[PDB]
Amino acid sequence: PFPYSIDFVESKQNEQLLKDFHGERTGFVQVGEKRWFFPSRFKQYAESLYSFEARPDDTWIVTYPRSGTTWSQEMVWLLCNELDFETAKSIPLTQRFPFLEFHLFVHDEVKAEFLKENEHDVESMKFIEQLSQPAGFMLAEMKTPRFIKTHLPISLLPPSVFEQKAKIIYVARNPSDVAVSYYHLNRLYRTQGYVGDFETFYNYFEKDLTPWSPYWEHIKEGWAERDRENVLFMYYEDMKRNLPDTIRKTAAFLGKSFSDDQIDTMCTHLDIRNFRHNKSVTELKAVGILNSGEQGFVRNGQVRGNAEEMTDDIKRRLNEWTERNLNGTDIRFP
Template structure:
């Protein structure tokens, strides 16, 4: 029954009009969900029952992140460690098939899908691509066990994850780098086609008006689960600081053990210079055809790149916001000074 589903509220007409002007690819708008005011594409309204009631298997492994927090990197790591380092399959089957994005169909609004199809009419390959993207939850649902599934939803919007005995790996990344990466993503992906500058994007981000936000509530929900034996809270900065150590940490959580040279092989496979060349992992204009304006889905894979985008004034504004949200919490990003 709808009364049992997450409560929704549409953004005001004025705010929607402003955001649609900046994000020309969106076409429809956004909703705010529950008291946390999770910001999601309006298509969520039609599909929320699918996600909220999605049946989770106890032998599932879920990768949960706020967008642009090292999700793809972690998916490939988790899949390899869980599948006895099956590099042959990893190099021949796309990651989006091995570990589908649960709510991908919600992220692409119908109007943009129709436009993309019209632009590429009589192209059976593109029609098939868009059709598959519109049914990712069905792909996830019908996968044979053990399943590997990715989501950007906060844990409270896919409640069966924590009700199950499945494994969950949550990855958090510092907000400045997340915002910069998400900004470039919005500029690149036709579904958003963001027209504004970074400073305006940061305002949306800080004011919880970016899809899958609010950022801090997303992280804090997961941080509260960090002592759950089926839950691993991992920082992106751990992976950039020492990928080999992070690989061993994830393997231990998954109940896997390998030789040192095997861990090194995994770490080498996952180095960004290699992932950027890996067509099974890095989405490009060649293998997605119509969704991206830039050449690559994976960008730099670095921590601290935000320095190039923040003016002194914007950094001060961001620092005040970060300090306020870290107050009265022991959440701390390792290996970086988040303020400077």
């Protein structure tokens, strides 16, 4: 029984969101007192998501979007699979490390466009249809330890995750870098279908009218669980600043043990230079669900601490938003 209210966004805001977000064609919902933001299919799948059955040997990665999720998944999958680089290379990360709630973001009317554009390839069409099915069905069938990615906040996780004490890695990333990266995610994924500029996107993000917002409630919930024995909380910039410490610490949290030589191969694999050529960074592309015109940011990233999309006005608003939300907490980005 799904315990929280699911209400459509107020009529006029909902109308404006549909003008700017072409990946959704019915509308957007806000969930419970914190008003967690989702497209319409959340209402259809809320019960089946919430009653998903975690296992005590599951490894969950829980992040706000573009908070180091793909890099962490690659690091974690390898640490839990005896550094099997060959298997990691040959099987896509989306199969090795499925995304619990991706199916929320495949609207029937957008799916029909994808199918039209791939109508002459039966395998492409099966792939697209599967995107719209819950990952939970194939996860439930697995008889080996599972690796689950989600952006669902702590308060919307299946209660079975904490009941079973499944291990959770929570990664937090500073809101300036999240805003710019999440903007690019919204342009890259036609399931989002965002058409506007960075400033219009920041306006939505600051109002918690982007999926999995409120951002600050996401971070605070993660911070409020980090003391549990089955939760490891890290800041994105700390993880990237010291790969050897990140790898050892993560390995230790997961109950795994590796040599200096093994830690070194994992540092090489996860180095920004090599990771830029990793398959998990570049299937979605082949059926044209990724926008091939938006691979600029994928190839190049942002100028560190001064994204070209950033304006002094938006910088100042990010500072004030940060102050309002972190005042009277001990949360501090590196």
